[PDB]
């Protein structure tokens, strides 16, 4: 039974190492959410600092890939950082060769093709991570593209990842069934973050302090992360209505 150790087909036409890589994805016990506004793309992720000896400022799973592209990872930090460094390298190389900023969906496709190779070549193992790429693309507008260890990728109106993804997914599904539009009809990114946090609170049934959340925002021509104090202002506004 060596067909379960390397990435060769099982008699059922399955790759078990790929399936087990998907399981590693939830080892961190962290849930991420991504939505689209009119002018922006917001990504929120749970932040857990279990050790008092840890420097909480260094504990992050959101990455600034390029000036325009942000990436949140669901999986262990070594593989997350492996994927982060590679995406940063690929984004920089693209701009040098082709003379324009790598689109979010194209970086997604590239990282998905690299993932596909680890499923076909034996000596390389799959990375135990799901990558969620966000940007305001200059052609496609607000963009969410997500990669997995199978080498699969697709676009999203909104998306959720982690142990409790199905609860968040259905909560978002129900909202978009009412509004009958593919985005959050809101002018400011501040209110789109407030929507993202509110709908995560409703879906997980948990309250959040400023230190419990981690927020990434993509606007036209920059992706940035919020500070604890920026999140606190967001939490105050939610409580006051």
């Amino acid at each position: 039974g060596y067909d379960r150790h390397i990435t060769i087909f099982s008699p059922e036409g399955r790759l078990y190492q790929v399936e087990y890589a998907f399981k590693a994805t939830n080892q961190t016990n962290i849930n991420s959410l991504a939505v689209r506004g009119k002018d922006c793309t917001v990504v929120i992720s749970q932040k857990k600092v279990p050790d008092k000896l840890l420097d909480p400022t260094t504990v992050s799973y959101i990455f600034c890939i390029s000036r325009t592209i942000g990436m949140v990872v669901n999986g262990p930090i070594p593989d997350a950082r492996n994927a982060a460094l590679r995406a940063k390298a690929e984004a920089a190389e693209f701009r040098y060769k082709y003379g324009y900023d790598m689109p979010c969906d194209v970086l997604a496709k590239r990282m998905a093709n690299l993932s596909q190779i680890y499923t076909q070549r034996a000596y390389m193992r799959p990375l135990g991570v799901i990558l969620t790429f966000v940007s305001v693309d200059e052609e496609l507008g607000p963009s969410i593209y997500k990669t997995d260890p199978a080498g699969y990728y697709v676009g999203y109106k909104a998306t959720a990842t982690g142990p409790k993804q199905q609860e968040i997914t259905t909560n978002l599904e129900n909202h978009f069934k009412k509004s009958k539009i593919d985005h959050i009809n809101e002018e400011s990114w501040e209110k789109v973050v407030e929507f993202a946090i509110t709908h995560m609170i409703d879906a997980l049934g948990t309250e959040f302090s400023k230190n419990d959340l981690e927020v990434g925002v993509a606007t036209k021509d920059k992706f940035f992360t919020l500070s604890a104090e920026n999140i606190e202002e967001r939490l105050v506004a939610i409580a006051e209505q």
Binding site: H5, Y16, K23, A24, D55, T58, V59, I77, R81
Partner: protein, 243 residues
Amino acid sequence: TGYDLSNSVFSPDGRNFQVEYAVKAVENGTTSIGIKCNDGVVFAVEKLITSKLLVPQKNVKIQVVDRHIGCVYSGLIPDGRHLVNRGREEAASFKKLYKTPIPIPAFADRLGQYVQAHTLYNSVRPFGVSTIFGGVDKNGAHLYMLEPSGSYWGYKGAATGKGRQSAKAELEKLVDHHPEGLSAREAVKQAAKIIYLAHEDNKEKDFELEISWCSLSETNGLHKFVKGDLLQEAIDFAQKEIN
């Protein structure tokens, strides 16, 4: 089963058992700690005196990278030396291209990516060390700890090896009782105490204390070993606290 015979194989859990076995080698090693102070970092390690024939103060364990980064590790000592050798290449190439000495976070990821790479193929073995390292850069003091998996985070305090649980408890007290922060000289005294307290897990053989520090005020942001009077003052403070 058989999922634990080959490195880079995912178990049905989604675990790399070879990496988890490497952690056992680390847990077997001597105690090593790191303390982040007001304007720098302190490193300390337990050296077991196997025999009287060991020359005192000669078998140095703490290793410098560039001139501003200290590295200490617990587990297979050779595996640590191999990792520091790579760190010294990475720090050399960075300085060669970008001029500025490698920032601590930047250096952390260089070790991180290299250790993680030794979990991608079954042609290599994972590193049998956990590495506590850090120093002073342009953005201030940074303390990091790096595991065989390639996992690392920033720390207020760090501990690894056989006496890690004892050490961690003593570090957690300092964080609570000093929210405003700890001075470099205080952190040397405290480092001595914590190694002496963590020696209860290795109480069979007597040991030799070895401390190093990088402080903006005390060492001008360079990595130096604590020697002579300041080392004896820390040993005296430690000996007074256990009695």
